[PDB]
C-alpha positions as semicolon CSV with decimal commas, in nm:
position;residue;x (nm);y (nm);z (nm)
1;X;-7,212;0,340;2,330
2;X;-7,242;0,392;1,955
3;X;-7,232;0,044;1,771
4;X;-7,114;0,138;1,398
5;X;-6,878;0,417;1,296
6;X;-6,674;0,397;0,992
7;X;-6,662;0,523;0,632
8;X;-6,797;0,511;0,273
9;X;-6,525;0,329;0,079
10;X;-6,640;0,470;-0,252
11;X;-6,502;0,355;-0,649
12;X;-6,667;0,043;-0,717
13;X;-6,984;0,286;-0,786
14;X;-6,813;0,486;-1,022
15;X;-6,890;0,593;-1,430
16;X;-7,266;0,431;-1,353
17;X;-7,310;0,510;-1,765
18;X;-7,071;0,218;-1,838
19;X;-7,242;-0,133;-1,815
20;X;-7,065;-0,346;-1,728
21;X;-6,777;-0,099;-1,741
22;X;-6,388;-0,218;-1,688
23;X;-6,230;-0,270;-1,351
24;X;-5,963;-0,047;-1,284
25;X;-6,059;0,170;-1,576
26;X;-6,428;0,279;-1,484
27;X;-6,395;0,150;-1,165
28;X;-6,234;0,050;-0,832
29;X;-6,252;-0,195;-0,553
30;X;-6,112;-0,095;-0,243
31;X;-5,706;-0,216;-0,134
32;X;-5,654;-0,421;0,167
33;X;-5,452;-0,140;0,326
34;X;-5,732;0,119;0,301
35;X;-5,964;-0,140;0,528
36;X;-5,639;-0,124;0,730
37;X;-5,593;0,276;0,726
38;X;-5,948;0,344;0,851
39;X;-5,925;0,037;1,118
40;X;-5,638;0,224;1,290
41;X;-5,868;0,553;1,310
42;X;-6,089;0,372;1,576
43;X;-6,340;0,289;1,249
44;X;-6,528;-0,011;1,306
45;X;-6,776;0,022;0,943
46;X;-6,718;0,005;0,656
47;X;-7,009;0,087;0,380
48;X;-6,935;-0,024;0,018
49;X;-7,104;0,126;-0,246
50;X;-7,154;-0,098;-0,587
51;X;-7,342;-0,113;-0,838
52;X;-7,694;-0,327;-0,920
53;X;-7,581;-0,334;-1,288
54;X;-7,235;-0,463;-1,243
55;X;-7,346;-0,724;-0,974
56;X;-7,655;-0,847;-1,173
57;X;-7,627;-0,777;-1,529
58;X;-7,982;-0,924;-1,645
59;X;-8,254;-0,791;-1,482
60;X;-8,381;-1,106;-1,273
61;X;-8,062;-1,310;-1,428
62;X;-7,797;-1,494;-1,202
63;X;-7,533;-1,265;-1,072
64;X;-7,183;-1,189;-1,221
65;X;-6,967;-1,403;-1,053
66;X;-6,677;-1,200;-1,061
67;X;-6,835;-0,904;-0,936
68;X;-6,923;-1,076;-0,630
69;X;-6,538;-1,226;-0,587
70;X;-6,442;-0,863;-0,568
71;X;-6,700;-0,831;-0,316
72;X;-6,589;-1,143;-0,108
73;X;-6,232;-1,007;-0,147
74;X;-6,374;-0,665;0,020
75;X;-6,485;-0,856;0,301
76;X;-6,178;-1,059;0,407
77;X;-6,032;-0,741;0,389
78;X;-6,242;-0,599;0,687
79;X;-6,299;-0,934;0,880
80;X;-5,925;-0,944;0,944
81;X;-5,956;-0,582;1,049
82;X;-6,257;-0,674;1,294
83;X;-6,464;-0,468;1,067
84;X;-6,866;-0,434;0,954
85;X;-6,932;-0,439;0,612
86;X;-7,227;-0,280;0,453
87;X;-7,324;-0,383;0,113
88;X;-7,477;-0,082;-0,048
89;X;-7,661;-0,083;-0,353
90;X;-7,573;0,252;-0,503
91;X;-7,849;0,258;-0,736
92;X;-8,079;0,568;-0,632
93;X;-8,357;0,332;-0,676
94;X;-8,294;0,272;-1,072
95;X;-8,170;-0,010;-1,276
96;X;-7,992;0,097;-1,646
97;X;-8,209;0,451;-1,583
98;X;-8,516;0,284;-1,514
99;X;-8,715;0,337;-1,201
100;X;-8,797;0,060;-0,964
101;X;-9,236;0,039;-0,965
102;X;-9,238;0,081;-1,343
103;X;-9,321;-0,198;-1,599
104;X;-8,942;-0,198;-1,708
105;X;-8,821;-0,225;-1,358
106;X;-9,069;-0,421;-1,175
107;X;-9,046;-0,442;-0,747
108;X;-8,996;-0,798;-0,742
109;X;-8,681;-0,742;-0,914
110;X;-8,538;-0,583;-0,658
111;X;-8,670;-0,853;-0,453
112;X;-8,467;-1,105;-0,688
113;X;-8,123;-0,921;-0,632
114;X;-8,141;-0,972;-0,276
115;X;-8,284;-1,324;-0,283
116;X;-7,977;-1,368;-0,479
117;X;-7,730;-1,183;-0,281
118;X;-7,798;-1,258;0,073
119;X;-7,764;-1,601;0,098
120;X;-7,426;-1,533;-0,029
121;X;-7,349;-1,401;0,352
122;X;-7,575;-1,580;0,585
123;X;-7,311;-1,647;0,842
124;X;-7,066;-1,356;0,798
125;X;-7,168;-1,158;1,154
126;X;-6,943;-0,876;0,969
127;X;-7,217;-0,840;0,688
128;X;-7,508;-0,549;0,713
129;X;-7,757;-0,527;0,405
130;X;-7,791;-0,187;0,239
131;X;-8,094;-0,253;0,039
132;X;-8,071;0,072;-0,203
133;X;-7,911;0,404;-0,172
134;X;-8,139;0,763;-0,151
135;X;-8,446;0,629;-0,316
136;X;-8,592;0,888;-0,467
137;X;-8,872;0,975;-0,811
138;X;-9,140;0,685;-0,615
139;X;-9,337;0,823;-0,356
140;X;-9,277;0,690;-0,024
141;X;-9,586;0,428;0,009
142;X;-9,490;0,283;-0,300
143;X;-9,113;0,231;-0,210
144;X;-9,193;0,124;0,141
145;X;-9,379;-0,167;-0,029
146;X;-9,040;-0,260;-0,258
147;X;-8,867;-0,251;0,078
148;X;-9,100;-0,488;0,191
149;X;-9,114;-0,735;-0,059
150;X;-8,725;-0,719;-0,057
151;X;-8,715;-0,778;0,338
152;X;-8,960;-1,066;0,309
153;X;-8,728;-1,196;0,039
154;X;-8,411;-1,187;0,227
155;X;-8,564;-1,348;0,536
156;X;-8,723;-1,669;0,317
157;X;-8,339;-1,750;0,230
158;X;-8,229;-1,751;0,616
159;X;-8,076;-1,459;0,651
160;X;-8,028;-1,318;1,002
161;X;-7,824;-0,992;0,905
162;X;-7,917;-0,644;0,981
163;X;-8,117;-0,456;0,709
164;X;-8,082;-0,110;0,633
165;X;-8,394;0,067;0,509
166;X;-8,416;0,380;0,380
167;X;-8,679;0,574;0,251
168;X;-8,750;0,777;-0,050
169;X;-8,666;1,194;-0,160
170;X;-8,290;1,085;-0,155
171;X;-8,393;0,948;0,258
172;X;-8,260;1,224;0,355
173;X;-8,307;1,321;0,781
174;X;-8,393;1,640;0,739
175;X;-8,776;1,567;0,538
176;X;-8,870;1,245;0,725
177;X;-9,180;1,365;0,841
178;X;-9,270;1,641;0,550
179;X;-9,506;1,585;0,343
180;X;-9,395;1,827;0,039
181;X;-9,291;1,451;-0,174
182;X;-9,625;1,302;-0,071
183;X;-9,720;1,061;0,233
184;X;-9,397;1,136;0,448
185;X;-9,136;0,876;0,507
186;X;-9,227;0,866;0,893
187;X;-9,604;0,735;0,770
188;X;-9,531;0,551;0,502
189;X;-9,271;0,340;0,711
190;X;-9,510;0,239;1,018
191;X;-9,639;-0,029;0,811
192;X;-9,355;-0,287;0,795
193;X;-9,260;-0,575;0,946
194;X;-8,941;-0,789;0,967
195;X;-8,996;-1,183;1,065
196;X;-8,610;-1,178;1,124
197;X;-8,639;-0,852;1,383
198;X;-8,310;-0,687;1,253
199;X;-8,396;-0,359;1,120
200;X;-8,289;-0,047;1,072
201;X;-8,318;0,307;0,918
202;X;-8,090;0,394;0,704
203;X;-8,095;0,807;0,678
204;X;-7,837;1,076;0,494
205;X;-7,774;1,400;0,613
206;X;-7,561;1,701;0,439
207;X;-7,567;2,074;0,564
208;X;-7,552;2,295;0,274
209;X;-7,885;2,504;0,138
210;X;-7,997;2,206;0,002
211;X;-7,886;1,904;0,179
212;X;-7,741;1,741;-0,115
213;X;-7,373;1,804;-0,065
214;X;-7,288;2,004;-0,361
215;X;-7,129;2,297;-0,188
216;X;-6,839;2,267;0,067
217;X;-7,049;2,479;0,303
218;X;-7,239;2,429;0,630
219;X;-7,524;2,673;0,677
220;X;-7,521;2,729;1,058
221;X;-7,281;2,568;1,337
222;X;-7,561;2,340;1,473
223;X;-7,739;2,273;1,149
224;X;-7,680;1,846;1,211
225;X;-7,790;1,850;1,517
226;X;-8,150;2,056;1,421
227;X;-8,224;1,833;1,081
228;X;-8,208;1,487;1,275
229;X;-8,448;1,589;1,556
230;X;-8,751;1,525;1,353
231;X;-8,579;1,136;1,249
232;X;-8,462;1,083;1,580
233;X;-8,777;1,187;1,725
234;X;-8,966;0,905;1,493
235;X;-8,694;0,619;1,643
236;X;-8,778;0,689;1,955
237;X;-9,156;0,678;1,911
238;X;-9,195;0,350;1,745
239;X;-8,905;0,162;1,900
240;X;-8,681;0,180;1,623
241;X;-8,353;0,179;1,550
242;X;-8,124;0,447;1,288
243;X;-7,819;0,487;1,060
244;X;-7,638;0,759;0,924
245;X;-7,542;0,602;0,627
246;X;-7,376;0,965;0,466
247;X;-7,282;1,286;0,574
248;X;-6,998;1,555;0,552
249;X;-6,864;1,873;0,651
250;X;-6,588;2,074;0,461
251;X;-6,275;2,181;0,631
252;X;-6,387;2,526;0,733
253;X;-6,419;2,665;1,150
254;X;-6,788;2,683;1,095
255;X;-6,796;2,343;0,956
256;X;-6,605;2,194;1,193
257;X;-6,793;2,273;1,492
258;X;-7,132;2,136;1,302
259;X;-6,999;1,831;1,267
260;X;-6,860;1,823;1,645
261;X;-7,206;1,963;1,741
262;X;-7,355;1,645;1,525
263;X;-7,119;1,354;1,625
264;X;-7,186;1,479;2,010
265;X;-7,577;1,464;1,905
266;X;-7,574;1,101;1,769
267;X;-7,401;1,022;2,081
268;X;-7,624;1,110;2,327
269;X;-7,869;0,968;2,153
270;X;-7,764;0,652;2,132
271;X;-8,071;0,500;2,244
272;X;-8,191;0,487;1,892
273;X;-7,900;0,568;1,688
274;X;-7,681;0,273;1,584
275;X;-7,376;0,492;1,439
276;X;-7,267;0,630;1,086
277;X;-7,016;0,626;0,772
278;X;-6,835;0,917;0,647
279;X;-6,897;1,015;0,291
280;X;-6,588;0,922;0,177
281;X;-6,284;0,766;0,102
282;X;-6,141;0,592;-0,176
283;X;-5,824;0,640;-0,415
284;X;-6,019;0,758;-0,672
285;X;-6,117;1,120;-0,540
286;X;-5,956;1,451;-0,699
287;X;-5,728;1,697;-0,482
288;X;-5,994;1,960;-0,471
289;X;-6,254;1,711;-0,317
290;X;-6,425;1,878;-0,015
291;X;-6,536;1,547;0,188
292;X;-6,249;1,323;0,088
293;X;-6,083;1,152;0,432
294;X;-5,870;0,887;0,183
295;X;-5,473;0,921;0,352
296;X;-5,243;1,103;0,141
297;X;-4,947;0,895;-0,066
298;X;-4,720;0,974;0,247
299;X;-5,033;0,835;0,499
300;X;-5,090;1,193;0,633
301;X;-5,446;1,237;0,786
302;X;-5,726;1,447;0,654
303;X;-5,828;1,772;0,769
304;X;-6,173;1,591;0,883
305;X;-5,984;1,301;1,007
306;X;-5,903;1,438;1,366
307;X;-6,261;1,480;1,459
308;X;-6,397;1,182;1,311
309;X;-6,123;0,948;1,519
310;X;-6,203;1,127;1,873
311;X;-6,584;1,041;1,799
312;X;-6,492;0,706;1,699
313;X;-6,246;0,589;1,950
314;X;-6,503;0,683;2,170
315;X;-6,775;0,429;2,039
316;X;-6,741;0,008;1,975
């Protein structure tokens, strides 16, 4: 009774230090086949990470119309594979590495992209709205107010799709309600409203030391499960609804059995959960990559792949 499950397609996010970079040099859209791939797996999402610079090149200015073709092209891809699409704006709340709130990077700006941008897919019933990936560097009332300016924005133009919120310190799961960044996430996020009434949380959750992903390790075998309680707990509360936008485990035992322990978690509670994307896939990921779920040349499965497929066969 999970809604979304799926993957990050990831390339088209790639070399952000190149503006406006070259495609298939600096960057990659995702093939036909890989929508395909990931369709046979059960996977009903798809998120798409891209980036504000290469879809927008003037702050404020019209969008690159070629950029957005590669976009459209993504889409046909997963509407003929009954698939969702989620635009994400990989952008970590920065434009040309510039923060969003500062005089270079006003909010309305933000605001602008997506005045621009979702118009574009109105109709399309396959198309979710990723508003920016793991703000973080603003505290949380002052991004909650950029996230409502941009939701206002969106819903002027007639757009009915689902919006995915996040909030700021990289919007992670496990520091939703702390306080150590400022006004939590949880307070700060009370405050807004959505005329359309399609609105979600949009929350990332890794399982090393950290909870950035940096090391191919999961601290504890139930370490998912324990850092979503306090964001699940929130949903539930204010009658609100959540994605898991990113997450990963290693192939490792230990690992393994957290992200079993986690899938089985979001499951249950359903309720409030709407589903999640695996960070990632994409042909552009080394050997050595810990998280990678991309097929092999041959079209042999992932290490990760097996567990993700029960957990999503079981959802739709």
């Amino acid at each position: 009774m999970l809604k979304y499950v799926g993957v990050n397609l990831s390339g088209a996010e790639f070399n952000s230090r190149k503006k406006p970079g070259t495609l298939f040099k600096d960057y990659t859209y995702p093939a036909a086949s890989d929508f395909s791939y990931f369709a046979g797996k059960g996977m009903n999402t798809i998120r798409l990470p891209f980036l504000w610079e290469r879809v927008q090149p003037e702050l404020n200015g019209p969008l690159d119309q070629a950029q957005l073709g590669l976009i459209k092209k993504s889409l046909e891809a997963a509407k003929a594979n009954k698939q969702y699409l989620i635009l994400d704006l990989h952008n970590y709340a920065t434009y040309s590495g510039k923060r969003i709130g500062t005089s270079d990077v006003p909010a309305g700006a933000l605001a602008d992209l997506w005045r621009r941008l979702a118009p574009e897919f109105k109709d399309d019933k396959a198309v979710i709205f990723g508003l920016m990936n793991e703000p973080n560097g603003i505290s949380a009332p002052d991004w909650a107010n950029a996230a409502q300016g941009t939701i206002t924005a969106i819903r002027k133009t007639g757009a009915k799709n689902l919006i995915l919120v996040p909030g700021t310190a990289y919007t992670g799961a496990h520091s939703w309600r702390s306080t150590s960044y400022g006004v939590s996430n949880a307070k700060a996020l009370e405050i807004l409203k959505d005329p359309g009434n399609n609105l979600a949380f949009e929350a990332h959750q890794y399982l090393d030391k950290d909870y950035s992903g940096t090391k191919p390790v999961c601290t504890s075998d139930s370490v998912g499960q324990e850092k979503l309680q306090g964001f699940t707990s929130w949903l539930r509360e204010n009658k609100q609804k959540g994605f898991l936008g990113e997450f990963a485990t290693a192939n490792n035992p230990v690992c393994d059995k957290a992200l079993e322990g986690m899938l089985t978690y979001m499951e249950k509670n359903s309720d409030v959960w709407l589903g999640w994307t695996w960070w990632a896939a994409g042909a552009w990921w080394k050997p050595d990559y810990p998280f990678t779920v991309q097929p092999g040349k041959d079209g042999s499965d992932k290490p990760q792949m097996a567990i993700l497929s029960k957990y999503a066969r079981r959802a739709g």
